[PDB]
């Protein structure tokens, strides 16, 4: 009947939810619990490079708050 | 409703072929899990429903 299509539909559904979910999780894992920063303009790229220099570990995603200020 | 009745027919089709092994046997040999009245069985072992 018409519900025999549903196994192939479910396989397609799993194979379509895997790329987006995995991409979001990989971005979060590689940026340390935060989303991957988007530098659409030179100002945002400069912010990312300033964060990378500020962190002292050459990783922009290691943010420094008020613990660096006396 | 009728959806639960369809699910009842489905679960009896699943648990109507003996066991899990019998269900897998009929599903991978005949590609069909319908339950029918056993009309007979011949001398060679073919079952007729």
């Amino acid at each position: 009947m018409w519900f025999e299509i549903l196994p192939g539909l479910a396989i397609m559904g799993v194979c379509l939810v895997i790329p987006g979910v995995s991409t979001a999780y990989i971005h979060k894992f590689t940026n340390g619990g935060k989303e991957k920063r988007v530098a659409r303009v030179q100002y945002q790229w400069y912010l990312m490079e300033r964060d990378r220099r500020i962190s002292g570990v050459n990783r922009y995603y290691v943010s420094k708050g008020l613990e660096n200020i006396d | 409703m009728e959806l639960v009745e369809v699910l009842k027919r489905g679960v009896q089709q699943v648990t109507g072929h003996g066991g899990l092994r019998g269900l897998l046997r009929v599903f991978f040999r005949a590609n069909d899990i319908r339950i029918g009245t056993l009309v007979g069985e011949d001398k060679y072992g073919n079952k007729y429903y």
């Binding site: 192939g8 396989i11 194979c15 790329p19 979001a24 988007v38 | -």
Partner: protein, 318 residues
Amino acid sequence: MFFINILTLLVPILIAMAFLTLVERKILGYMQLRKGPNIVGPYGILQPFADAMKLFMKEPMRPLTTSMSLFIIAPTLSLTLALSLWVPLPMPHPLINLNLGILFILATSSLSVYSILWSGWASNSKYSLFGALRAVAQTISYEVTMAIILLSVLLMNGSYSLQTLITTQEHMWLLLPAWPMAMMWFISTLAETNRAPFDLTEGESELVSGFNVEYAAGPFALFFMAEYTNIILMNALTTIIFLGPLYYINLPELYSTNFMMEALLLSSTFLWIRASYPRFRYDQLMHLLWKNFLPLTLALCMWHISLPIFTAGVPPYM
């Protein structure tokens, strides 16, 4: 980790393509009062793997009249451009984040048309030549109309990125403001993907097989994979652009699930349309896209030029 991201994008897209072939067989069968494949595997789920293995263990054809270099180059080009078009889509986060995403999409689609053209010319056969020329006419018509459609839609959106489209459809689908050009975009995607009634290049009844009539086994498999990956691709692009899935900052899994459901619905609509309609004649396709779609597309482009100006709803740059 980026290579693992490449793998977890590429491999599930390929498996979804193969099960799209299976689900096309099942849906077409059930619309044709039959069942479709349910023997090879539990419910037919091993049928695409059987077909892939058979095609990759059948010998390829190298005809005497055929230009070998372009004959080899065309199918691998087609598959690479299909996966490249897949790469920048956000669900809701793209693997490759671009600024001019739809321009990348348009360039890669036209290069896929070139893959079809070079296959048809390299396979030195008259039916292949027919398929190449029909591809030329088809891509002329849908290229001009689809470019104007996408221009109007992104004029409503404000930028060429696609995360911007997610932010645009945060509150409402673009189907409600832009449903006529949504219909014209859907027809344009059908013609772009060469699906019935606008296939006209793998003409089963008019030609024999058209542009890939001399292709066998492996390269034919590459062409089929490229085409069906493009089907899922264009339906995914349609649901990203027009039917905006629910996006929440705290969880993107809801966006991925809604995107998957809408993309599956649009792909099933493609199979439904192939079942329902007879094939166009390829001059009638050009006459349609140049006499009905194009004047209305120009009018709606002017309307979407005017609309943010007199409503003060000019979209943000970022």
